[PDB]
C-alpha cells in the first residue's frame, strides 16, 4: 500500500517561521557566511511529500521469519512493568505541544485535575475501543543546516498531549528495556559515545581481517510496513504485561502505529499515513527493531561472515569477516537486495570500507588522537558543519534545545568541540553572567537540564580525563576541519587559541566551578600546563540513565 495518501491541504506551520540567520554581534565572532546557513520550514514541505510517498514492496522469507522467532525468544524473558499517570507524567518534558482538550505540558507535570482526569479517559478509551483510527497532527521540522555545493524540511507525525501520556503508561518500561534484552550488544542507544567507540574498535579487531560498512535505508520511516508495525507488536507481546497494557498495546497498535488520518495546524484533513508515524513512544524502539531484523536476515542471505552489527532506529553498521575485495563487493549488493526485499531500500549505495575511521555511522565515526603520555586514544567524532551551523543560529535566537551543549557533552575529545564550542560558548556565558544557569538539551532524543559548570566532571566520567589532554590529531580529522572552518568562515585556530587563553584567565579569577572550567577544558590554550589530576564529583556521578534506549520523537524528559 502507499506510504502516504493526500488529500490537497498543505502542511502548514503554526506562526511566523524564520528562514535565514540573523545577523548577529555573536553569532558573527563564530561563522561569518551567514547565508550559507539556513532553517527548513513549511514552504519545503511539498518537496519533501513527494520523497516520502510511495508504494511499499515487501516479500518474506525464511531467513527473517527465523530470525524474528529468535528476537521473539529473547523478548519472551522480559516483564514489562506499566507506569501509573503520576509517572508517565513526570516524563513530560515542560515545554512540550500542548494538548487541544484544554490543557498543556505544565499542567500535565502539575498533575492538574484537568488534565489527570482527560488523561484517564483516553486511557480508558484506548481499552475500549480497539479499531478507530487515532488522530495525528503532520508538521514540518524546522532544522539548521549549512547550504551544500538544500535539505527539504522532515515531517513528524504525533498524537494529542494526552494520547503520549498514555503511551508512556503502557510502552515506557517495554522500550527501555526490550531493545537490549532483544538484540544485546548490537543495540547502540546502551552505550556512551566512548563505549560505542570501544564496541567497535574492538568487534573490529576482533576480525582475522576486518570488513565493515554502514547501511542507510532511503526515508526509512516510509519503508515501515502495516506488516512490520505488527511484526513489532508482536515482539511486544513476549512481554508479561498488566492486562491493560496488552490491550493498550493491541489498540495503539491498530490505532496509532500502523497509521491513521493525518491533520494539519488549521485543523484540516491532510491525509492518510499507512507507515511509522515519528513522533510516536515506539518510534526509536520500533525503527531499531525492525532494521536489526531485515538487516540480520539480510546478513544471512547475502552470506556474510561473523557479523557484528550495531543498530540505532534506522541508522545501521555492519562488520563482518573478509572474503576478499570482490567476494565482500558481491556479498554487499546481496545484502543490499535482501535489505530490498524486505522493504528496506538504500538511499546511499553501501560501499565496503577496510578503513574503521572511514565508517560513518550515526552521522559519526571512530578517529584516533593522543593524550599527555602520549599513548593513542580512540574517541567518536564527525563533520562539524552541521553542529557549527547550528551553534550559530541557537547563538543567535532563543531555542528550546541547546544542541550546542549537547554537542559538547557528547564530543568534548574532538579538535572542533573544545577549540570552537567551549571557547565560544564559555566567553559568551561568563559575558552575559550565565555561567550559573541550566540549559535544555537533547541525549539520544531524551530531554535533559544540565549546568554548564558541570561540563568538565560530566567530561571526566564519560570521556576520562583524557578528554582535556588530547593532542595530535588524525591528518585526516584536521583536514575536515579546517577545511569545515574555510567554507563556513569561522576563525583559525590563533584566534580561537587568543579568545580562550582570555576566557580561561577570567574563568580561574572566578574560583569554584568557574576555575575547574578554566583549569580542565581550555588548557590545551596555554603553554604552561597545569596538572589535571581526577574531579572528586566525577566519581560520584549517576550516568547511567543517559546511555540506555533511544527516545527521538518519544516525547521523553529525565526530570
Ligand atoms: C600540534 C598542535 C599545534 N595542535 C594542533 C593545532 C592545529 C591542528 O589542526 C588544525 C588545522 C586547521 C584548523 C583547525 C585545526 C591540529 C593540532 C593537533 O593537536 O593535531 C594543538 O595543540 C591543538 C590541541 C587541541 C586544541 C583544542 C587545539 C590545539
Ligand atoms: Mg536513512
Given at each position: 500500500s502507499?506510504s502516504?495518501?493526500?488529500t490537497?491541504?498543505?502542511?502548514?506551520?503554526?506562526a511566523?517561521?524564520?528562514?535565514?540567520?540573523?545577523?548577529?554581534?555573536?553569532?558573527?565572532?563564530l561563522?561569518?557566511?551567514?547565508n550559507?546557513?539556513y532553517?527548513?520550514?513549511?514552504?519545503?514541505?511539498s518537496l519533501?511529500?513527494?520523497?516520502?510517498?510511495?508504494?511499499?514492496?515487501?516479500?518474506?522469507?525464511?531467513?527473517?521469519?527465523?530470525?524474528?522467532k529468535?528476537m521473539?525468544?529473547?523478548?519472551?524473558?522480559?516483564?514489562?512493568?506499566?507506569?501509573?499517570?503520576?509517572?508517565?507524567?513526570?516524563?513530560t518534558?515542560?515545554?512540550?505541544?500542548?494538548?487541544?482538550?484544554?490543557?498543556?505540558?505544565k499542567?500535565?507535570r502539575?498533575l492538574?485535575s484537568?488534565?489527570?482526569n482527560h488523561?484517564?479517559?483516553?486511557?480508558?478509551?484506548?481499552?475500549?475501543d480497539?479499531?478507530?483510527?487515532?488522530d495525528?497532527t503532520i508538521?514540518?521540522?524546522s532544522?539548521?543546516?549549512?547550504?551544500?555545493?538544500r535539505?527539504?524540511?522532515?515531517?513528524?507525525?504525533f498524537?494529542?498531549?494526552?494520547?503520549?501520556?498514555?503511551?508512556?503508561?503502557?510502552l515506557?518500561?517495554?522500550?527501555?528495556?526490550?531493545?537490549?534484552?532483544?538484540?544485546?550488544?548490537?543495540?547502540?542507544?546502551?552505550?556512551?559515545?566512548?563505549?560505542?567507540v570501544?564496541f567497535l574498535?574492538?568487534?573490529?579487531?576482533?576480525?582475522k581481517c576486518?570488513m565493515?560498512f554502514?547501511?542507510?535505508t532511503?526515508c526509512?520511516?516510509?519503508?515501515?510496513?502495516?506488516?512490520?508495525i505488527?511484526?513489532?507488536?508482536s515482539?511486544?507481546?513476549?512481554?508479561?504485561?498488566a492486562?491493560?497494557?496488552?490491550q493498550?498495546?493491541?489498540?495503539?497498535?491498530e490505532?496509532?502505529?500502523?497509521?491513521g488520518?493525518?491533520?494539519?495546524?488549521?485543523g484540516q484533513?491532510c491525509?492518510?499515513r499507512?507507515?511509522?508515524?515519528?513522533g510516536?513512544?515506539?518510534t526509536?524502539?520500533?525503527?531499531?527493531?525492525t532494521?536489526?531484523?531485515?538487516?540480520?536476515?539480510?546478513?544471512?542471505?547475502?552470506?556474510?561472515?561473523?557479523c557484528?552489527?550495531?543498530?540505532?532506529?534506522?541508522?545501521?553498521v555492519?562488520i563482518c569477516?573478509?572474503?576478499?575485495?570482490?567476494?565482500?563487493?558481491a556479498?554487499?549488493?546481496?545484502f543490499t537486495?535482501?535489505?530490498?526485499?524486505?522493504?528496506?531500500?538504500?538511499?546511499?549505495p553501501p560501499?565496503?570500507?577496510?578503513?574503521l575511521?572511514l565508517?560513518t555511522?550515526?552521522?559519526?565515526?571512530?578517529?584516533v588522537?593522543?593524550?599527555?603520555?602520549?599513548?593513542?586514544?580512540?574517541y567518536?567524532?564527525?563533520?562539524?558543519?552541521?553542529?557549527?551551523a547550528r551553534?550559530?543560529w541557537?547563538?543567535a535566537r532563543?531555542?528550546?534545545?541547546?544542541?550546542?551543549?549537547?554537542?559538547?557533552?557528547?564530543?568534548?575529545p574532538?579538535?572542533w568541540?573544545?577549540m570552537?564550542?567551549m571557547?565560544?560558548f564559555?566567553?559568551?556565558?561568563?559575558?552575559?553572567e550565565?555561567?550559573?544557569?541550566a540549559?535544555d538539551?537533547?541525549?539520544?532524543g531524551?530531554?535533559?537540564?544540565?549546568?554548564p559548570?558541570?561540563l568538565?566532571?560530566?567530561?571526566?566520567?564519560?570521556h576520562?580525563?583524557?578528554?582535556?589532554t588530547?593532542?595530535?590529531?588524525?591528518?585526516?580529522?584536521?583536514?575536515?576541519?579546517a577545511?569545515?572552518?574555510?567554507?563556513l568562515?569561522?576563525?583559525?585556530?590563533?584566534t580561537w587559541?587568543?579568545?580562550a587563553?582570555?576566557?580561561?584567565?577570567?574563568?580561574?579569577?572566578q574560583?569554584?566551578?568557574?576555575?575547574?572550567?578554566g583549569?580542565?577544558?581550555?588548557?590545551?590554550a596555554?603553554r604552561?600546563?597545569?596538572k589535571?589530576?581526577?574531579?572528586?564529583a566525577?566519581?560520584?556521578?549517576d550516568?547511567?540513565?543517559?546511555?540506555?534506549?533511544?527516545?527521538?520523537?518519544?516525547?521523553?524528559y529525565?526530570?
Amino acid at each position: 500500500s502507499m506510504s502516504y495518501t493526500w488529500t490537497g491541504a498543505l502542511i502548514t506551520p503554526c506562526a511566523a517561521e524564520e528562514s535565514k540567520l540573523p545577523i548577529n554581534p555573536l553569532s558573527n565572532s563564530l561563522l561569518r557566511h551567514h547565508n550559507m546557513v539556513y532553517a527548513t520550514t513549511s514552504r519545503s514541505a511539498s518537496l519533501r511529500q513527494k520523497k516520502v510517498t510511495f508504494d511499499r514492496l515487501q516479500v518474506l522469507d525464511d531467513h527473517y521469519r527465523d530470525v524474528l522467532k529468535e528476537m521473539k525468544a529473547k523478548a519472551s524473558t522480559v516483564k514489562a512493568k506499566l507506569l501509573s499517570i503520576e509517572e508517565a507524567c513526570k516524563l513530560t518534558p515542560p515545554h512540550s505541544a500542548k494538548s487541544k482538550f484544554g490543557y498543556g505540558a505544565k499542567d500535565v507535570r502539575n498533575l492538574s485535575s484537568r488534565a489527570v482526569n482527560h488523561i484517564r479517559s483516553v486511557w480508558e478509551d484506548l481499552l475500549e475501543d480497539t479499531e478507530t483510527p487515532i488522530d495525528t497532527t503532520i508538521m514540518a521540522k524546522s532544522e539548521v543546516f549549512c547550504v551544500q555545493p538544500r535539505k527539504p524540511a522532515r515531517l513528524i507525525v504525533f498524537p494529542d498531549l494526552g494520547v503520549r501520556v498514555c503511551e508512556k503508561m503502557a510502552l515506557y518500561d517495554v522500550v527501555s528495556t526490550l531493545p537490549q534484552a532483544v538484540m544485546g550488544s548490537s543495540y547502540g542507544f546502551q552505550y556512551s559515545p566512548k563505549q560505542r567507540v570501544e564496541f567497535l574498535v574492538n568487534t573490529w579487531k576482533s576480525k582475522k581481517c576486518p570488513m565493515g560498512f554502514s547501511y542507510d535505508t532511503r526515508c526509512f520511516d516510509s519503508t515501515v510496513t502495516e506488516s512490520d508495525i505488527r511484526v513489532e507488536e508482536s515482539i511486544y507481546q513476549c512481554c508479561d504485561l498488566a492486562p491493560e497494557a496488552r490491550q493498550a498495546i493491541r489498540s495503539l497498535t491498530e490505532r496509532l502505529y500502523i497509521g491513521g488520518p493525518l491533520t494539519n495546524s488549521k485543523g484540516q484533513n491532510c491525509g492518510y499515513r499507512r507507515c511509522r508515524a515519528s513522533g510516536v513512544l515506539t518510534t526509536s524502539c520500533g525503527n531499531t527493531l525492525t532494521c536489526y531484523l531485515k538487516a540480520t536476515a539480510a546478513c544471512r542471505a547475502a552470506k556474510l561472515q561473523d557479523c557484528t552489527m550495531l543498530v540505532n532506529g534506522d541508522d545501521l553498521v555492519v562488520i563482518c569477516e573478509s572474503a576478499g575485495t570482490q567476494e565482500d563487493a558481491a556479498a554487499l549488493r546481496a545484502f543490499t537486495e535482501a535489505m530490498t526485499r524486505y522493504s528496506a531500500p538504500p538511499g546511499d549505495p553501501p560501499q565496503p570500507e577496510y578503513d574503521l575511521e572511514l565508517i560513518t555511522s550515526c552521522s559519526s565515526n571512530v578517529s584516533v588522537a593522543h593524550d599527555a603520555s602520549g599513548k593513542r586514544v580512540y574517541y567518536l567524532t564527525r563533520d562539524p558543519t552541521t553542529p557549527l551551523a547550528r551553534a550559530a543560529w541557537e547563538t543567535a535566537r532563543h531555542t528550546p534545545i541547546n544542541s550546542w551543549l549537547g554537542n559538547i557533552i557528547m564530543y568534548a575529545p574532538t579538535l572542533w568541540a573544545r577549540m570552537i564550542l567551549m571557547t565560544h560558548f564559555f566567553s559568551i556565558l561568563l559575558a552575559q553572567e550565565q555561567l550559573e544557569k541550566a540549559l535544555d538539551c537533547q541525549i539520544y532524543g531524551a530531554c535533559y537540564s544540565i549546568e554548564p559548570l558541570d561540563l568538565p566532571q560530566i567530561i571526566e566520567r564519560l570521556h576520562g580525563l583524557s578528554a582535556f589532554t588530547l593532542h595530535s590529531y588524525s591528518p585526516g580529522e584536521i583536514n575536515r576541519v579546517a577545511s569545515c572552518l574555510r567554507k563556513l568562515g569561522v576563525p583559525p585556530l590563533r584566534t580561537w587559541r587568543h579568545r580562550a587563553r582570555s576566557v580561561r584567565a577570567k574563568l580561574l579569577s572566578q574560583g569554584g566551578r568557574a576555575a575547574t572550567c578554566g583549569r580542565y577544558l581550555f588548557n590545551w590554550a596555554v603553554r604552561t600546563k597545569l596538572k589535571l589530576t581526577p574531579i572528586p564529583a566525577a566519581s560520584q556521578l549517576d550516568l547511567s540513565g543517559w546511555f540506555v534506549a533511544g527516545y527521538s520523537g518519544g516525547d521523553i524528559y529525565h526530570s
